[PDB]
RNA sequence: AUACAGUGAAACUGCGAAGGCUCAUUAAAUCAGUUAUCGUUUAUUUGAUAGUUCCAUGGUAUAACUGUGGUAA
RNA sequence: GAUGGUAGGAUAGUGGCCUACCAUGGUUUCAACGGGUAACGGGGAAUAAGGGUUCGAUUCCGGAGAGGGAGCCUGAGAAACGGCUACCACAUCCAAGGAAGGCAGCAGGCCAAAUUACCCAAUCCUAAUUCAGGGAGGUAGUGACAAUAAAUAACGAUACAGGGCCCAUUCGGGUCUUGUAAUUGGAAUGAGUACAAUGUAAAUACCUUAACGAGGAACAAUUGGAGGGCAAGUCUGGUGCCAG
């Protein structure tokens, strides 16, 4: 059954509508998600 | 209900649009219940898709049981309790109770080498061997998702190492850290919470690609051109893959159908279905080919070839371990071992498997030689192909389950399957100055395995060195050379003082099979209830059973390898070994100099290897004592395993010399049962054992000569009469076979022998007849060498008679 | 209520289910009554019904239970 | 083993019930032995009903069976609806290593595929019991075969007309308070809507029953038959205006 939510996965046009170390994961999803953009090299001056 | 992210569905969309695999790494506890959603997204991105799913785990499932009658009666008694209604299933229960899941342990990953899956669920992260990684991400196909679940210790390592360079704090493992950094580098991989949020540390930006295959259309065009008989039927049955594989099958068919002899050897990677092309060409060869064919695979390892043979036969016209017997209905084929079918090679066609080079030269002589060269040595086999046989050997490397994949690129980069044989030196004559210098530096393996770009390029050079034409090692051996406690390395590459650059002249991996350090590491690892890191000590601790070797620490060579240029490369390896003996005797940067002047308290230094001739010559330039071997035929090459161990320490010379003496005493008797190898190499081994005894002993293990009454009891008086009959008459077997055992024993005991007389003593020790051993070795003057052997026997009999009697 | 003391998942226990469909056609041999069993079995019901003793309390071995595990189960 | 005798075996014991030995018996025209069914029928097998005279209450058709024969086990009672072993076929899971039960079953259907809900309150049965229960058993619901008794109106007043009805082939004859979408009046209650209480383990239903409930009493029964009549209408025929 597309256009409906078989389980929880309701399919819109392009978006998907689903539903439902602790503080470490919550902080890495709150602030430190794309904070590791300029953290790749760590002075790797190759 | 909540919209998830603009990137995680779009990644699956463009992954199935470009037919590329993709990697999800999920953290958190409630992570099993989001594989329903990712499998639904993977199917609805493109219905025309494989449905099966792997659940590789190591010891125990997460929250379920994988037995549907068991969980069915469990949910039946849950109904009978009444905490849950009848027609109710949460999506994880529905996912495991409706989908097609194949369950494997992490140990038996070799059981699923052939089949194909749409999804792979790696359950545990902390133990992930790279051979298992290479076996699962290869079988995941182009619309595929490989998901990896995590643990709180890995979350601590993630929060640590996601800042710049820090690690986790207690054998420490860096392969999983190199894994985390590679997934941070990958564009087709990202890390997701248990709540379907995003950690953008691994491939942050991802756009939805635009809505829409020329090599596939060229494949269809050339396939239809070949279509417009039974040759086209075989071509369409084979070409389930790239036009490279189709062109290879067509060219092998053209060069091996009616031309009866060519030597065609198709070389390819782990993909592309080389065995599939062989088994799909088998039916065409049975049609337009001889009545007998000869396969040379491993025994009971011909799954894809036999499956494609039966599949193509059923396509065209058909109907102690396993069954590999020959069948026909309107043909013969046998998957045999090494060439015991020399007189049974009436088959005009033989197809061999990938690399035993001398056994390959023995088997491939008088028929059409098809050969499958899997990459998974090759240069030397191509040289032996060009050194003899209209060789039309050609094949290509386009993938089968993809056209090209960043997941395959990251897997090859992390598991280090990529190689490069470029020079990149200062000079070869200036590397000969390094061969005069014998200068070596340590590896600093933590900073080496920390994935940085130039460090990874030099580490790929080091891996190409450490597995360059080696003795068939593997990715689990790379993980042992990375993440073991008893390990070190040495890169004696450059002598020059130029700018940033260099090479790898010789890698050499040590293994501290110790007493103190190994006892410390083993008492540590007994809390983790595992551990096996003492091979060279434990072989002699049962064979020779010495408390001295129980108390002395030891370094053991895991591997050591140099370039494949010339004999100067063996000179470079000898200089590296001599520099290592000098090194034993006399974040972080990815080298060491002061630690190259540092070591441990080690007594013995040994290398364990197979009994090879050049390895024996290297062991003699090494001159490390040729200690106790084992003549059990290790079925890879059939080579006997010898562990030559020097003692380079304060006071161990009497122990090592007595061990060499016991090995020498055992070898002359053990050359009768299961050591019938050579004459010159046997003399070299006896000379190496006596050289070890002479170098180690001063006058301690100095044996007395053959005593009078004991020598009278060892022979007979009439046996010595027959010896005199050989001295003044013929040396026939009525007096030269009953006494020859004691003759060869006393000759190898203790007053000199020639080269022909030494081969005669070794020939009587090997107990072969006259026309075999001397005619194989010298191949000249058979009866004259037999008379010289009789004269040496007469001189020995005259010496023993004039000594005792 | 410092050797037991009420609720009580899961285990031993006492008992429960204490009598239900289809298929091939046996003429006092299937059946019903009756005579007898000092010719015989019998839980339960009922009435009855036990006489040998030289120079202050008897033994480890298993649960449930803990702990280490295997197996897809 | 036919008939009996003697002894043993096995039995819960009697017993040619089985075996050794021995004798050649035994039933029958005073019906042996054998032949079949309205033996889905009969025999009392039993209740009978205040008029049904072989319809009209029930026990039992014969023995088996728990996939198929075989062997074993348990118990006061068994060759167990609930056990095991081996053989042969069905048959599901499986990671292909192995673990099983029986569902090769019972319900249904060939323009009525829904029974499978509530109780031991009654009668019995088991029960340690002044307690527990019994898909024994009872209660209720969907699932019409127009078979069954009632309703869809009753009673007045006023007005205004002169015609209504019957017979007969014909002419005609015979007779008499009869009509009308005319007005109008207050009484009646029943279907329905509903208080309850009773009933019952409980609930339904029957029984009893306050409140409301009629004018198109629209709170709106059918089915079939006989005959007309009409247009600036349409069609056909042809000796105007007609015939069909």
């Amino acid at each position: 059954a597309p256009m409906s939510d078989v389980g929880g996965v309701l399919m819109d046009k392009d978006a998907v509508y689903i539903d439902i170390e602790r503080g470490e994961g919550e902080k890495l999803m709150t602030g430190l998600q794309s904070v590791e953009q300029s953290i790749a090299e760590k002075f790797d001056g190759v | 209900k909540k919209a998830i992210d603009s990137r995680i569905p779009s990644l699956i969309r463009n992954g199935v649009q470009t037919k590329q695999r993709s990697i999800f790494v999920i953290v958190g506890d409630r992570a099993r219940n989001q594989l329903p959603n990712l499998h639904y997204l993977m199917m609805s991105a493109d219905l025309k898709m494989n449905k099966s799913v792997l659940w590789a785990y190591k010891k125990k499932l997460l929250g379920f049981t994988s037995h549907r009658k068991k969980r069915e009666n469990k949910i039946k008694k849950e109904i009978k309790r009444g905490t849950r209604e009848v027609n109710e299933m949460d999506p994880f229960e529905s996912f495991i109770s409706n989908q097609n899941i194949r369950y494997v342990y992490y140990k038996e990953s070799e059981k699923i080498l052939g089949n194909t899956y749409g999804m792979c669920i790696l359950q545990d992260f902390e133990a992930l061997t790279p051979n298992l990684l290479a076996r699962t991400i290869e079988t995941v196909e182009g619309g595929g998702i490989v998901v990896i679940l995590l643990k709180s210790m890995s979350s601590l390592k993630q929060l640590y190492t996601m800042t710049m360079d820090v690690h986790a704090r207690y054998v420490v493992a860096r392969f999983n850290e190199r894994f985390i950094l590679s997934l941070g580098s990958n564009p087709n991989c990202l890390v997701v919470d248990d709540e379907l949020n995003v950690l953008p540390l691994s491939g942050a930006k991802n756009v939805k690609p635009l809505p829409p295959d020329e090599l596939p259309p060229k494949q269809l065009e050339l396939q239809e051109l070949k279509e417009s008989d039974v040759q086209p039927a075989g071509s369409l049955v084979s070409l389930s893959k790239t036009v490279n594989q189709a062109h290879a099958i067509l060219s092998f068919i053209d060069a091996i159908s009616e031309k009866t002899v060519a030597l065609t050897a198709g070389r390819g990677r782990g993909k592309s279905a080389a065995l599939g092309i062989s088994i799909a060409a088998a039916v065409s060869h049975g049609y337009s080919n001889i009545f007998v064919t000869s396969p040379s695979p491993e025994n009971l390892k011909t799954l894809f070839e036999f499956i494609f043979k039966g599949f193509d036969a059923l396509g065209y016209q058909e109907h102690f371990n396993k069954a590999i017997v020959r069948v026909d209905i309107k043909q013969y084929i046998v998957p045999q071992d090494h060439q015991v079918l020399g007189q049974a090679e009436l088959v005009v066609i033989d197809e061999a498997a990938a690399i035993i080079v001398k056994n390959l030269l023995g088997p491939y002589l008088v028929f059409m030689a098809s050969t499958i060269n899997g990459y998974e040595l090759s240069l030397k086999l191509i040289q032996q192909l060009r050194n003899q046989q209209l060789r039309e050997i050609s094949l290509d490397e386009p993938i089968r389950y993809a056209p090209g994949d960043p997941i395959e690129k990251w897997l090859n980069k992390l598991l280090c399957l990529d190689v490069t044989l470029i020079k990149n030196p200062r000079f070869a004559t200036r590397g000969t100055p390094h061969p005069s210098q014998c200068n070596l530096f340590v590896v600093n393996r933590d900073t080496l395995f920390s994935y940085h770009p130039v460090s990874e390029n030099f580490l790929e050079k080091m891996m190409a060195l450490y597995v360059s034409s080696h003795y068939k090692n593997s990715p689990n051996d790379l993980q042992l050379m990375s993440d073991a406690p008893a390990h070190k390395l040495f890169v004696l590459l450059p002598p020059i003082d130029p700018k940033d650059g260099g090479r790898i002249p010789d890698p050499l991996c040590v293994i501290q099979i110790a007493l103190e350090g190994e006892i410390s590491k083993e008492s540590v690892r007994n809390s983790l209830s595992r551990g096996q890191r003492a091979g060279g000590d434990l072989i002699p601790w049962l064979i020779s059973q010495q408390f001295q070797d129980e108390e002395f620490a030891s370094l053991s060579g895991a591997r050591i390898v140099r370039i494949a240029t010339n004999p100067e490369y063996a000179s470079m390896g000898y200089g590296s070994r001599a520099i290592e003996l000098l090194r034993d005797y006399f974040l972080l940067l990815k080298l060491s100099e002061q630690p190259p002047h540092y070591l441990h308290y080690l007594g013995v230094s040994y290398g364990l290897t197979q009994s090879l001739h050049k390895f024996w010559k290297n062991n003699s330039f090494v001159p490390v004592y040729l200690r106790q071997t084992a003549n059990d035929l290790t079925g890879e090459h059939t080579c006997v395993m010898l562990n030559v161990l020097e003692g380079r320490e304060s006071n161990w010379l009497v122990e090592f010399a007595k061990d060499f003496r016991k090995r020498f005493l055992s070898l002359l008797s053990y050359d009768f049962h299961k050591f019938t190898a050579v004459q010159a190499l046997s003399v070299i081994e006896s000379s190496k054992k006596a050289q070890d005894l002479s170098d180690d002993e001063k006058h301690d293990n100095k044996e007395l000569t053959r005593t009078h009454l004991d020598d009278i009891f060892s022979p007979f008086d009439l046996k010595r009469l027959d010896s005199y009959s050989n001295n003044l008459l013929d040396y026939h077997v009525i007096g030269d076979m009953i006494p020859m055992l004691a003759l060869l024993y006393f000759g190898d005991k203790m007053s000199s022998v020639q080269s022909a007389i030494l081969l005669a003593i070794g020939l009587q020790r090997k107990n072969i007849d006259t026309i075999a051993k001397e005619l194989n070795l010298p191949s000249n003057q058979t009866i004259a060498m037999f008379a010289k052997i009789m004269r040496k026997m007469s001189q020995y009999f005259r010496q023993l008679l004039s000594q005792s009697i």
Side-chain angles (χ1 to χ4, degrees), chain A residues 1-20 23 25 31 40 45, chain B residues 1-152 168 171-200 203-204 209 211-212 216-217 232-234 246 248 255 262 265-266 268 270 273-274 276 280-282 286 295 297 310 313 315 323 335 342 344 352-354 362-363 369 374 398 402-404 406 425 428 431 433 435 453 464 475 484-486 494-495 498 501-502 505 507 514 517 531 534-536 540 553 557-558 564 567 570 573 575 578 595-596 603 607 623 630 635 647 657 677 680 690 715 735 739 742 747 756 760 762 772 778 784 787:
Chain A
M3 315 168 177
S4 198
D5 44 352
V6 183
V9 288
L10 165 74
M11 295 286 196
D12 211 323
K13 199 50 166 144
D14 51 287
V16 184
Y17 288 87
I18 319 168
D19 44 344
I20 65 183
Chain B
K1 304 284 187 188
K2 181 60 200 72
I4 44 172
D5 277 325
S6 159
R7 272 90 42 81
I8 53 177
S10 72
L11 183 60
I12 323 166
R13 265 71 169 270
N14 52 69
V16 73
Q17 177 184 5
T18 62
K19 307 163 296 317
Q20 296 178 7
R21 319 158 176 103
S22 176
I23 322 287
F24 275 86
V25 175
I26 313 193
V27 313
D29 311 67
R30 278 186 55 177
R32 53 182 91 101
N33 51 3
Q34 318 301 127
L35 320 165
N37 309 339
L38 278 158
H39 190 91
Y40 192 89
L41 284 154
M42 186 257 292
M43 292 301 302
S44 70
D46 194 306
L47 275 82
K48 195 187 301 167
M49 178 61 209
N50 210 18
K51 291 194 176 51
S52 299
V53 49
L54 259 177
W55 202 295
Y57 65 119
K58 56 153 182 54
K59 212 178 161 287
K60 193 184 57 188
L61 302 163
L62 288 174
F64 67 102
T65 184
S66 169
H67 194 278
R68 60 173 75 254
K69 198 252 174 177
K70 178 175 190 170
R71 57 180 187 248
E72 192 208 312
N73 54 73
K74 164 70 202 63
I75 212 59
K76 182 193 185 188
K77 55 189 55 54
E78 169 87 1
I79 292 317
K80 292 185 190 191
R81 257 82 56 85
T83 81
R84 157 158 159 158
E85 71 94 6
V86 174
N87 294 286
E88 160 71 31
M89 291 194 288
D90 60 306
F92 182 60
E93 271 181 359
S94 299
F95 170 77
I96 61 181
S97 158
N98 305 130
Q99 294 286 333
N100 199 293
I101 321 186
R102 170 71 140 97
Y103 291 90
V104 284
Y105 280 120
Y106 281 175
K107 60 218 64 162
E108 42 174 30
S109 65
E110 45 267 26
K111 214 188 293 182
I112 49 163
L113 80 159
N115 44 10
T116 322
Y117 300 90
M119 206 189 189
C120 202
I121 299 173
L122 274 306
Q123 207 181 268
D124 303 81
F125 167 67
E126 271 73 31
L128 279 163
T129 176
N131 63 91
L132 179 135
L133 257 62
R135 261 189 282 251
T136 65
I137 312 193
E138 194 187 75
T139 198
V140 165
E141 74 162 10
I145 300 303
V146 178
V147 80
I148 296 163
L149 289 82
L150 282 191
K151 165 67 86 169
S152 159
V171 49
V172 76
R174 319 139 189 87
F175 185 71
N176 43 2
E177 200 45 70
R178 176 173 165 81
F179 192 57
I180 283 180
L181 264 70
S182 70
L183 303 188
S185 67
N186 212 28
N188 304 12
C189 167
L190 82 168
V191 188
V192 184
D193 289 331
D194 51 326
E195 305 305 282
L196 265 298
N197 309 123
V198 54
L199 308 97

